Design a binder for this molecule. Structure first.
Ligand SMILES: C[C@H](NC(=O)[C@H](Cc1ccccc1)N1Cc2ccccc2C1=O)C(=O)O
Ligand SMILES: C[C@H](NC(=O)[C@H](Cc1ccccc1)N1Cc2ccccc2C1=O)C(=O)O
Lengths: 165, 163
């Protein structure tokens, strides 16, 4: 759907980028993006795949290797080839009489499925992070804020999710 | 998006299926060739949302097998969601005519340095499901290799995490 795209960025005054990368299946993934950082400024998100760092393929790099590669890098014009959230998946649920789609969450992660709900009928999975509800990003938000977003939404609740890491 | 399918139990009271409990959901792990499941279009990695109008959410691998074993009569209803963990990746063949991955039993086991698989971030422990639209699950490695060589420079494949 989205072919890998190019991203260029600079280390901040403190020498940081705002990224925390995770090694999954001989590929590198964005595990954390600090707010108001170079990573967030260029559009990096939790779930994005880092294919290349400075023209070098990241295939089979350990997490510590990726972090050290970024540490040693020249603080200016750090390039990257990103593959937008490969494990992302969309699921549409419907609110019941009581105004709920039927699942429990903790730190933005789905923890349980309520019996006879839209989450149960649609097959929502547990141990999945909620990325976006009806278009707005919910990563980094407080649980109370996700709950507020869910109540202001209409009957049709379309969420994007991905396996947790 | 999901679809309702209707199966008929075979000669032995079996449906030709094996299911796996992944993250409080039910998934098709194996489909036997020429069986009631194969006929309706059930494939590996498909999600079983309901059996006989019952939400499969939370069911163990054992519970879902028991439900099917002790199912009432000849006809069985199922609500299915087509391969949720399916993802499509595109590679390009080099001078030697290769994209850069080693596979065994239809599963990607290694990525070759300085290749299109490496550049594209292709993941290991992933089953290949389709090569240029053509299904490859059930096929022997040589038939998969044969279809890989038949393709042009552009190799588009669908894959899913191995389970
Ligand atoms: C996604 C949303 N879930 C919730 O309304 C649940 C509360 C709940 C409602 C119905 C059945 C069972 C539990 N919350 C709301 C909430 C707020 C803060 C922290 C955690 C939670 C939580 O699990 C929904 O399914 O509509
Ligand atoms: C996808 C395809 N891969 C293969 O031709 C690999 C061997 C290979 C040759 C050269 C470079 C990288 C890997 N096969 C082909 C094959 C046939 C039967 C059993 C195992 C294998 C196997 O690992 C390609 O790279 O275009």
């Amino acid at each position: 759907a989205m072919d890998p795209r190019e991203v260029i960025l600079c280390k901040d005054q403190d020498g940081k980028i705002g990224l925390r990368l995770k090694s999954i299946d001989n590929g590198i993934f964005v595990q954390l993006v600090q707010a108001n950082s170079p990573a967030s400024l260029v559009g990096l998100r939790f779930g994005d795949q880092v294919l290349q760092i400075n023209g070098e393929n990241c295939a089979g790099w350990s997490s510590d290797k990726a972090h050290k590669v970024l540490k040693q890098a020249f603080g200016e014009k750090i390039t990257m080839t990103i593959r937008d959230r490969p494990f992302e998946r969309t699921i549409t649920m419907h609110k019941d009489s009581t105004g709920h789609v039927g699942f429990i969450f903790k730190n933005g992660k789905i923890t349980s499925i309520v019996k006879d709900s839209s989450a149960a009928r649609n097959g929502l999975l547990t141990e999945h992070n909620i990325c976006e509800i009806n278009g707005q990003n919910v990563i980094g938000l407080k649980d109370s804020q996700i709950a507020d977003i869910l109540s202001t939404s209409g009957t049709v609740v379309t969420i994007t999710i991905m396996p947790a890491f």
